[PDB]
């Protein structure tokens, strides 16, 4: 068991929270291009045989209710769980249409002790959002214990679009740099490569192929690196190999 069992009857859910339009009172700008990401993700995970549910323009309360309700489903026949968050953000925070939600509140519903039918199974959170206001200017190139337990934080993978503290960038026509790159690398490589190696290729693609273009010099010629955060305990492949 160097690899997660992915031959349950269902690969699992892929919940996509697509927040485009924000309450006027928040000051947050419409996230042009996010529907392109939401559609790309839906097709990409369809082809990986996930049950995709797209949700659009959820309040902070609706995000928490959705995540609570999804965590209370019986996932026993599912191999894994995927949640994609597309919104404005700050470090540790994703925005509902009407204000901030701590990411930890969301992911806690899926802890090994709180969502028992996902215990031992990979729980993936893919987060396209800023993590702060830093800009990357780039650079030119004895005891066995008896009862076995696992940590309640084990088997999570957080695929952040950007490094801690930094901006994350989006193109109004093409979608976010990270989600564009993630879908392209899953389409190209999910039938062979292990997920960390797919995400490493996503890192390279975002790092090398994108550079911002802005009439505002403050935001021009900027760069981005995504940030893979893994508490996984096994290799993750999006396929299984039949025995006959």
């Amino acid at each position: 068991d160097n690899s997660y069992k992915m031959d349950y009857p269902e690969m699992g859910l892929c919940i996509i929270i697509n927040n485009k339009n924000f309450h006027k009172s928040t000051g947050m700008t419409s996230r042009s291009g996010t529907d392109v990401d939401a559609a790309n993700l839906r097709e990409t995970f369809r082809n990986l045989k996930y049950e995709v549910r797209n949700k659009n323009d959820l309040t902070r309360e609706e995000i928490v209710e959705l995540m609570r309700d999804v965590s209370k489903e019986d996932h026993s026949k599912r191999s894994s769980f995927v949640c994609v968050l597309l919104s404005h953000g700050e470090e540790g925070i994703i925005f509902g249409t009407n204000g901030p939600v701590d990411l930890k509140k969301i992911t806690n519903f899926f802890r090994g002790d709180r969502c028992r039918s996902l215990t031992g199974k990979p729980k993936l959170f893919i987060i396209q959002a800023c993590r702060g206001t830093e800009l990357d200017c780039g650079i030119e190139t004895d005891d066995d214990m008896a009862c076995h337990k696992i940590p309640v934080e084990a088997d999570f993978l957080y695929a952040y679009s950007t490094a801690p503290g930094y901006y994350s960038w989006r193109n109004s026509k093409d979608g976010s740099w990270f989600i564009q790159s993630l879908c392209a690398m899953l389409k190209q490589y999910a039938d062979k490569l292990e997920f960390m190696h797919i995400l490493t290729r996503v890192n390279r693609k975002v790092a090398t192929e994108f550079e911002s273009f802005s009439f505002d010099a403050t935001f021009h010629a900027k760069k981005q690196i995504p940030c893979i955060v893994s508490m996984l305990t096994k290799e993750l492949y999006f396929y299984h190999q039949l025995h006959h």
């Binding site: 959002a129 800023c130 989006r170 193109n171 911002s212 273009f213 935001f219």
Partner: peptide
Amino acid sequence: XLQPX
């Protein structure tokens, strides 16, 4: 074209 999240 370019927008921040």
